[PDB]
Amino acid sequence: MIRLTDNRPIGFIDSGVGGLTVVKEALKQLPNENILFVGDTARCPYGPRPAEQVIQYTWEMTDYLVEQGIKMLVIACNTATAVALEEIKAALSIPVIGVILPGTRAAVKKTQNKQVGIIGTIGTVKSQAYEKALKEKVPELTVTSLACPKFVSVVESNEYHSSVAKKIVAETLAPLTTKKIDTLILGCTHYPLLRPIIQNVMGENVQLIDSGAETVGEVSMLLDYFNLSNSPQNGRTLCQFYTTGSAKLFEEIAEDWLGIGHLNVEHIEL
Amino acid sequence: MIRLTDNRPIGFIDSGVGGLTVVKEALKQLPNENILFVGDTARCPYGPRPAEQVIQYTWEMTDYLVEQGIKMLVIACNTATAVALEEIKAALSIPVIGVILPGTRAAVKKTQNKQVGIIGTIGTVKSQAYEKALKEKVPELTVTSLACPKFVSVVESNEYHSSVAKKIVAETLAPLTTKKIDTLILGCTHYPLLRPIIQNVMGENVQLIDSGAETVGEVSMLLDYFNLSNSPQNGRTLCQFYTTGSAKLFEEIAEDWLGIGHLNVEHIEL
């Protein structure tokens, strides 16, 4: 059993800053892995854009990180996952993972009464990506999908602990607390910052599924499958962030969400 | 996101009958997947044999199932996993999974005080496969490995619930109950049949890790990664067992362990 020590970094790409919560989970779950992240904030959001454009931009972020030396790629964007993941995965020689299926898989396992909910942006909800993936696994599931329009703004404004946040979450999820849902998927990478509030509003009897966290769980298994793990003797020595937009704003957001002090953020061009 | 419905079966190979517990877990965790299993009982055990021989026999079982149409391969044998997995995985175009790493991964996650134990045959223990894999992930772990020589005979004789079994397990594991071990890996596929007895002897404060069960957990993730899942509308329609030895004895063992009635067992030649 020849195990190879590979200290190349794992790459993460996103149109915006939401993917930072996926990196946060990677830092915790994969303590010995190096990390590279790109947030295409200069062109965020990708949702409204035609597929041709989304694929082009996602390829630009991908190419950038591949040239920086990544050994595996995590597409932390829902739109990029739904629109460009298949093409990129087929073309590259490195493993490529998206966020939707891992969360869906976890939800199917966690639910007991088969009443599953999923919250996310209106784009994610309207795409039906989660409902379809859930039903393709278990047709008997009763799936409730709910768009939460203002959640992203609250988190990106670093006000996810404010009175405004508690009010917005409480009022937005109200109709979701009367369907006997026992499993709720956080279908937007920004939502983990609002988890305490979401948990309180939904109740202790509701299991929340963090799709990004589940995605990192898949990465852990894939590192072993593809023989790409770094060693503990090496440990994490690199964690670099790149953004096509304001490095100042990106750093303000990143350092607040990750809560681990100073971070390395560099403005780049794609 | 183009999802492909693939009703081809998942294959499982083993030198003996131990791998049946891995199939048992697959039946439970993957209710919609078809299954094919080959037990090379006419040449069991592989352990004492030179690598050249082990690889040849494992390739024969592999070739047989590939020709039967499998879409993924699970090597449920420790010796085959340690000796032939790498070569077979590199050569085939289908995913190939072994049992050691999945269990090791689960153990590292479950342990809190870092006192991890692993029980298995003397061959598995002496190979240090588990200790090495565990240490490669977390060097600080204190790993205790213990061979349990008679466990296999008790299970293959379908006496895993007898007074003899309780006595054998109690006396064999005695020295393992005084090391503050909080996580114990069942490093032999026959051991799940003795789990209740093992749990009682170790104590409720000890988390047992079923390597075969963890391996099936990896399979679940890989079906999504490689887009090879069967659909729930199809469901499991096929579960066939093949053995190079006595079909009568194999069936006696299989039907007892699986406890789901009549099974399809066919004697074959490799």
XYZ file of C-alpha atoms in Angstrom:
540
model
C 0.000 0.000 0.000
C 2.085 2.891 -1.341
C 0.864 6.138 0.259
C 2.004 9.361 -1.419
C 2.561 12.554 0.560
C 1.232 15.416 -1.565
C 1.572 18.892 -0.079
C 0.020 20.643 -3.075
C -2.973 22.757 -2.005
C -6.666 22.000 -2.389
C -8.383 24.708 -4.409
C -11.753 26.357 -3.768
C -13.520 28.682 -6.210
C -16.621 30.832 -5.882
C -18.229 33.759 -7.656
C -18.413 35.543 -4.319
C -17.465 35.289 -0.643
C -19.963 32.671 0.516
C -17.463 29.912 -0.217
C -15.384 31.172 2.695
C -17.519 29.021 5.009
C -16.445 25.974 3.010
C -12.823 26.999 3.587
C -13.618 27.474 7.277
C -14.805 23.843 7.400
C -11.741 22.667 5.469
C -9.444 24.375 7.992
C -11.172 22.466 10.793
C -11.718 19.063 9.144
C -8.471 18.934 7.146
C -5.871 20.476 9.515
C -2.932 19.262 7.423
C -4.089 20.453 4.006
C -2.879 23.565 2.214
C -5.564 25.870 0.827
C -6.044 28.257 -2.115
C -9.300 30.184 -2.646
C -10.518 32.474 -5.420
C -13.585 34.698 -5.125
C -14.618 36.353 -8.415
C -16.277 39.285 -6.661
C -15.643 41.582 -9.633
C -18.236 39.560 -11.565
C -20.498 38.249 -8.782
C -23.301 37.129 -9.098
C -23.195 34.421 -11.782
C -26.834 33.382 -11.424
C -28.475 35.889 -13.843
C -25.795 35.288 -16.461
C -26.241 32.967 -19.453
C -24.577 29.553 -19.110
C -21.909 30.448 -21.673
C -20.710 33.259 -19.403
C -20.868 31.278 -16.151
C -18.782 28.483 -17.683
C -16.216 30.944 -19.030
C -15.726 32.678 -15.676
C -15.625 29.428 -13.733
C -12.996 28.120 -16.171
C -10.937 31.270 -15.605
C -10.920 30.727 -11.821
C -10.184 27.032 -12.348
C -7.305 27.679 -14.746
C -5.839 30.210 -12.322
C -5.735 27.766 -9.395
C -4.578 24.833 -11.510
C -1.640 26.978 -12.639
C -1.015 27.825 -8.975
C -0.570 24.091 -8.389
C -3.754 22.665 -6.874
C -4.231 18.890 -6.671
C -8.017 18.924 -6.215
C -10.809 21.431 -6.903
C -13.891 22.338 -4.881
C -16.497 24.449 -6.683
C -18.195 26.208 -3.773
C -20.697 28.057 -5.993
C -24.200 26.641 -6.614
C -24.556 28.163 -10.065
C -21.089 27.028 -11.123
C -21.788 23.567 -9.667
C -25.079 23.261 -11.544
C -23.796 24.805 -14.770
C -20.049 24.180 -15.147
C -19.003 21.337 -12.820
C -19.656 18.543 -15.317
C -17.584 20.117 -18.105
C -14.658 21.051 -15.865
C -14.622 17.685 -14.096
C -14.539 15.858 -17.428
C -11.685 17.997 -18.771
C -9.290 18.157 -15.797
C -7.103 15.348 -14.463
C -7.658 16.348 -10.841
C -10.717 15.501 -8.710
C -13.482 18.124 -8.803
C -16.271 18.344 -6.213
C -19.465 20.411 -5.986
C -21.610 21.292 -2.951
C -25.172 20.140 -3.768
C -24.949 16.322 -3.784
C -22.936 16.019 -0.541
C -25.570 18.006 1.341
C -28.391 16.079 -0.333
C -26.759 12.779 0.635
C -26.458 13.890 4.258
C -30.089 15.060 4.368
C -31.417 11.730 3.081
C -29.452 9.929 5.792
C -30.457 12.268 8.636
C -34.212 12.503 8.033
C -36.506 10.134 9.926
C -40.040 11.327 9.127
C -39.061 12.166 5.540
C -40.081 15.826 5.924
C -37.097 17.687 4.476
C -36.641 21.389 3.964
C -34.066 23.459 2.140
C -33.438 27.191 2.287
C -31.283 29.215 -0.060
C -31.373 32.115 -2.498
C -34.379 32.425 -4.780
C -32.173 31.340 -7.672
C -31.155 28.121 -5.944
C -34.721 27.442 -4.840
C -36.255 28.142 -8.251
C -33.677 25.922 -9.971
C -35.090 23.019 -7.931
C -31.570 21.559 -7.819
C -31.997 20.306 -4.254
C -35.557 19.044 -4.613
C -34.593 17.082 -7.724
C -31.463 15.587 -6.146
C -33.405 14.669 -3.005
C -36.267 13.038 -4.932
C -33.852 11.151 -7.215
C -32.617 9.406 -4.075
C -35.885 9.061 -2.141
C -39.119 9.778 -4.093
C -41.273 9.501 -0.948
C -39.691 12.596 0.613
C -41.895 15.644 1.168
C -39.609 18.523 0.247
C -40.279 22.141 1.175
C -38.040 24.710 -0.524
C -37.933 28.295 0.737
C -36.063 31.310 -0.624
C -34.582 33.610 2.046
C -33.893 36.810 -0.030
C -32.183 38.961 2.605
C -30.024 36.392 4.425
C -27.024 36.956 2.159
C -27.005 40.735 2.674
C -27.122 40.293 6.463
C -24.123 37.957 6.454
C -22.020 39.886 3.900
C -22.604 43.008 6.007
C -21.183 41.140 9.014
C -24.460 41.651 10.904
C -25.306 37.967 11.354
C -25.428 38.414 15.148
C -27.509 41.609 15.173
C -31.119 42.245 16.157
C -31.884 42.808 12.478
C -30.624 39.316 11.643
C -32.719 37.635 14.337
C -35.784 39.508 13.094
C -35.160 38.729 9.428
C -34.518 35.026 10.044
C -37.459 34.611 12.422
C -39.942 36.238 10.045
C -38.568 34.575 6.915
C -38.623 31.017 8.293
C -41.921 31.320 10.196
C -43.971 29.388 7.592
C -41.335 26.647 7.700
C -41.835 25.842 11.394
C -45.269 24.266 10.888
C -44.561 21.403 8.469
C -43.020 18.887 10.869
C -39.720 19.199 9.003
C -37.034 17.287 10.918
C -34.149 18.041 8.546
C -33.256 21.422 7.031
C -30.549 21.907 4.414
C -28.628 25.177 4.545
C -28.540 25.530 0.761
C -26.486 28.745 0.606
C -22.863 28.931 1.747
C -23.523 32.216 3.560
C -26.014 30.590 5.941
C -23.617 28.871 8.354
C -22.995 32.316 9.887
C -26.700 32.449 10.810
C -26.881 28.865 12.105
C -27.434 29.685 15.792
C -30.380 31.919 14.882
C -31.733 29.402 12.381
C -31.480 26.580 14.931
C -33.319 28.621 17.561
C -36.135 29.489 15.152
C -36.516 25.935 13.825
C -36.237 24.198 17.187
C -33.910 21.648 18.777
C -35.812 18.829 17.057
C -34.621 19.974 13.625
C -31.304 18.711 12.267
C -29.536 21.290 10.109
C -27.401 20.125 7.184
C -24.472 22.356 6.222
C -23.843 21.492 2.553
C -20.380 23.026 2.560
C -19.401 21.003 5.624
C -20.670 17.822 3.983
C -18.705 18.694 0.844
C -15.515 18.933 2.894
C -16.437 15.547 4.320
C -16.384 14.161 0.778
C -13.004 15.794 0.143
C -11.597 13.902 3.128
C -12.664 10.589 1.593
C -11.431 11.572 -1.878
C -7.952 12.470 -0.599
C -7.623 8.852 0.536
C -9.233 7.424 -2.615
C -6.956 9.319 -4.976
C -3.865 9.010 -2.743
C -3.490 12.804 -2.516
C -3.237 13.398 1.243
C -0.618 15.721 2.731
C 1.189 14.408 5.813
C 0.798 15.572 9.433
C 4.571 16.083 9.634
C 4.160 18.727 6.933
C 0.884 20.145 8.226
C -0.860 23.157 6.692
C 1.797 25.676 5.687
C -0.201 27.631 3.116
C -3.602 29.351 3.100
C -3.890 32.027 0.415
C -6.963 33.913 -0.791
C -7.360 35.631 -4.159
C -10.105 38.023 -5.223
C -10.821 39.839 -8.482
C -12.608 42.574 -6.568
C -11.686 44.691 -3.551
C -9.056 42.935 -1.454
C -9.893 45.322 1.381
C -13.561 44.344 1.548
C -12.739 40.677 0.998
C -10.281 40.722 3.900
C -12.773 42.538 6.135
C -15.327 39.810 5.476
C -12.941 36.844 5.539
C -11.206 37.752 8.798
C -14.565 38.320 10.493
C -16.139 35.037 9.348
C -13.081 32.846 9.954
C -12.234 34.514 13.254
C -8.593 33.415 13.219
C -6.858 36.754 12.827
C -4.911 38.097 9.863
C -5.401 36.355 6.516
C -3.467 36.497 3.240
C -5.660 38.181 0.625
C -4.382 39.201 -2.798
C -6.188 41.098 -5.551
C -5.775 39.374 -8.912
C -7.023 39.744 -12.472
C -8.788 37.095 -14.567
C -26.412 18.422 -13.810
C -26.878 15.277 -15.906
C -27.511 12.321 -13.571
C -27.134 8.860 -15.113
C -29.190 5.902 -13.911
C -26.873 2.885 -13.882
C -28.428 -0.400 -12.789
C -25.237 -2.409 -13.272
C -24.268 -4.205 -10.045
C -21.573 -3.291 -7.543
C -19.081 -6.120 -7.170
C -17.516 -7.486 -3.980
C -14.646 -9.984 -3.880
C -13.041 -11.900 -1.033
C -10.819 -14.923 -0.562
C -13.365 -16.278 1.894
C -16.778 -15.637 3.449
C -15.925 -12.761 5.781
C -16.801 -10.257 3.067
C -20.435 -11.273 3.456
C -20.727 -8.741 6.291
C -19.705 -6.023 3.841
C -22.517 -7.175 1.547
C -24.870 -7.156 4.537
C -24.001 -3.475 5.088
C -24.407 -2.716 1.378
C -27.906 -4.235 1.408
C -28.846 -1.908 4.267
C -27.038 1.297 3.239
C -27.569 1.000 -0.527
C -31.135 -0.390 -0.847
C -31.335 0.393 -4.566
C -28.041 -1.133 -5.684
C -27.614 -4.502 -7.366
C -24.966 -6.801 -5.900
C -22.537 -9.494 -7.094
C -20.160 -11.283 -4.696
C -17.383 -13.818 -5.231
C -15.780 -15.812 -2.422
C -12.688 -17.791 -3.500
C -13.143 -20.391 -0.768
C -11.396 -23.061 -2.849
C -8.142 -21.143 -2.317
C -8.761 -19.379 1.012
C -6.666 -18.148 2.831
C -4.519 -15.795 0.734
C -2.413 -14.515 3.628
C 0.349 -17.197 3.668
C 0.683 -17.070 -0.109
C 3.397 -15.105 -1.929
C 2.266 -11.774 -3.403
C 2.480 -13.122 -6.956
C -0.187 -15.703 -6.109
C -2.471 -13.338 -4.181
C -2.468 -10.871 -7.083
C -3.210 -13.618 -9.604
C -6.197 -14.961 -7.660
C -7.568 -11.511 -6.908
C -7.300 -10.658 -10.618
C -9.228 -13.829 -11.462
C -12.113 -12.835 -9.160
C -11.968 -9.278 -10.502
C -12.001 -10.372 -14.144
C -14.942 -12.672 -13.439
C -17.117 -9.903 -11.972
C -16.064 -7.317 -14.544
C -17.194 -9.745 -17.252
C -20.454 -10.179 -15.324
C -20.977 -6.433 -15.747
C -20.026 -4.656 -12.521
C -19.663 -0.863 -12.482
C -17.599 -0.627 -9.284
C -15.432 -3.036 -7.272
C -15.069 -3.515 -3.523
C -12.143 -5.677 -2.402
C -13.393 -6.974 0.945
C -10.197 -8.931 1.692
C -7.404 -7.403 3.820
C -4.614 -9.308 2.105
C -5.949 -8.507 -1.359
C -6.425 -4.862 -0.324
C -2.866 -4.598 0.985
C -1.296 -6.590 -1.844
C -3.362 -6.229 -5.033
C -5.654 -3.190 -4.714
C -3.161 -0.685 -6.121
C -2.433 -2.699 -9.277
C -6.073 -3.521 -10.002
C -7.263 0.026 -9.321
C -4.654 1.431 -11.702
C -5.565 -1.013 -14.480
C -9.387 -0.949 -14.429
C -11.646 1.871 -15.607
C -14.130 1.349 -12.782
C -13.766 2.618 -9.194
C -12.079 0.164 -6.813
C -12.301 0.418 -3.016
C -10.554 -1.422 -0.171
C -11.565 -1.808 3.492
C -8.600 -0.562 5.574
C -8.513 3.207 4.933
C -12.270 3.784 5.391
C -12.147 2.191 8.837
C -8.952 4.059 9.717
C -10.549 7.354 8.675
C -13.586 6.672 10.857
C -11.420 5.732 13.856
C -9.395 8.953 13.664
C -12.628 10.953 13.645
C -14.304 9.035 16.488
C -11.457 8.943 19.020
C -11.312 11.649 21.687
C -8.512 10.571 24.041
C -6.430 9.252 21.133
C -6.282 5.729 22.600
C -7.180 3.540 19.621
C -7.288 -0.216 19.396
C -7.649 -2.634 16.520
C -8.374 -6.351 16.581
C -8.062 -8.762 13.693
C -6.297 -11.925 12.577
C -2.645 -12.337 13.487
C -1.771 -11.735 9.843
C -3.564 -8.395 9.761
C -2.098 -7.385 13.111
C 1.460 -8.403 12.227
C 1.262 -6.557 8.898
C 0.762 -3.355 10.916
C -1.487 -2.094 8.108
C -3.880 -0.397 10.528
C -1.262 1.012 12.883
C 0.624 2.526 9.949
C -2.501 4.021 8.358
C -3.621 5.419 11.716
C -0.222 6.966 12.504
C 0.097 8.424 8.985
C -3.003 10.462 9.802
C -2.382 11.223 13.487
C 1.138 10.460 14.829
C 0.115 11.237 18.428
C -2.270 8.268 18.569
C -1.463 5.439 20.978
C -2.377 2.344 18.990
C -2.867 -1.091 20.524
C -3.138 -3.970 18.046
C -4.378 -7.376 19.189
C -4.698 -10.635 17.261
C -7.824 -12.677 18.080
C -6.851 -16.138 16.631
C -10.088 -18.048 17.236
C -12.717 -15.406 16.414
C -12.923 -16.408 12.752
C -13.546 -20.093 13.517
C -16.355 -19.192 15.938
C -18.129 -17.048 13.348
C -17.620 -19.387 10.359
C -19.043 -22.194 12.509
C -22.152 -20.061 13.085
C -21.541 -20.154 16.852
C -21.138 -16.400 17.341
C -23.998 -16.378 19.876
C -22.871 -19.424 21.875
C -21.359 -19.730 25.342
C -18.078 -20.689 23.682
C -18.043 -17.400 21.769
C -18.678 -15.290 24.869
C -15.874 -17.122 26.667
C -13.414 -16.827 23.787
C -14.085 -13.120 23.235
C -14.011 -12.255 26.940
C -10.694 -14.013 27.546
C -9.073 -12.820 24.322
C -9.894 -9.124 24.802
C -9.268 -9.008 28.568
C -5.850 -7.290 28.271
C -7.460 -4.711 25.984
C -9.932 -3.440 28.595
C -7.261 -1.743 30.723
C -5.694 0.762 28.313
C -8.377 3.458 28.337
C -9.068 2.736 24.667
C -12.144 4.710 23.579
C -12.206 3.512 19.962
C -11.805 -0.072 18.731
C -11.551 -1.022 15.064
C -13.063 -4.356 14.065
C -10.234 -5.167 11.659
C -11.608 -8.489 10.372
C -14.807 -8.741 8.330
C -15.964 -11.741 10.375
C -16.110 -9.701 13.590
C -19.395 -7.843 13.060
C -21.165 -11.107 13.962
C -19.516 -10.917 17.404
C -20.192 -7.199 17.926
C -22.717 -7.536 20.769
C -20.264 -9.692 22.727
C -17.338 -7.423 21.890
C -19.297 -4.332 22.960
C -20.259 -5.934 26.272
C -16.662 -6.925 27.023
C -15.197 -3.541 26.053
C -17.858 -1.430 27.744
C -20.419 1.157 26.650
C -17.725 3.852 26.689
C -15.915 2.236 23.753
C -16.917 3.136 20.199
C -16.535 0.218 17.795
C -15.585 0.900 14.175
C -16.843 -1.594 11.590
C -14.377 -1.216 8.694
C -16.681 -2.932 6.224
C -19.543 -0.613 7.157
C -17.292 2.414 6.715
C -16.185 1.060 3.336
C -19.809 0.888 2.206
C -20.123 4.468 3.403
C -17.358 5.412 0.966
C -19.120 3.525 -1.832
C -22.203 5.681 -1.262
C -20.156 8.839 -1.807
C -18.333 7.376 -4.820
C -21.586 6.443 -6.578
C -22.462 10.147 -6.553
C -18.934 11.273 -7.471
C -18.682 8.982 -10.477
C -22.352 9.382 -11.483
C -22.981 5.628 -11.171
C -26.062 5.477 -8.928
C -29.008 3.205 -9.722
C -32.453 4.776 -9.329
C -35.049 4.081 -6.610
C -37.640 3.384 -9.319
C -35.455 0.461 -10.384
C -34.437 -0.602 -6.884
C -32.317 -3.673 -6.148
C -33.384 -6.441 -8.516
C -30.246 -8.576 -8.364
C -28.162 -10.088 -5.556
C -26.068 -13.048 -6.702
C -23.288 -14.888 -4.874
C -20.546 -16.974 -6.481
C -18.113 -19.317 -4.755
C -15.258 -21.469 -6.036
C -15.742 -23.848 -3.130
C -18.768 -25.634 -1.685
C -21.957 -23.791 -2.596
C -23.734 -25.767 0.118
C -21.466 -24.569 2.921
C -21.360 -21.048 1.503
C -25.159 -20.882 1.446
C -25.388 -22.271 4.985
C -23.097 -19.502 6.202
C -24.500 -16.690 4.053
C -28.161 -17.296 4.881
C -27.351 -17.464 8.595
C -25.281 -14.259 8.687
C -27.573 -12.188 6.456
C -30.743 -13.491 8.083
C -32.976 -12.613 5.133
C -33.973 -16.068 3.958
C -33.015 -17.867 0.759
C -30.033 -16.516 -1.181
C -28.760 -17.161 -4.710
C -25.449 -19.021 -4.469
C -23.694 -20.517 -7.481
C -20.536 -22.626 -7.598
C -18.121 -21.347 -10.238
C -14.612 -22.072 -11.475
C -11.727 -19.598 -11.758
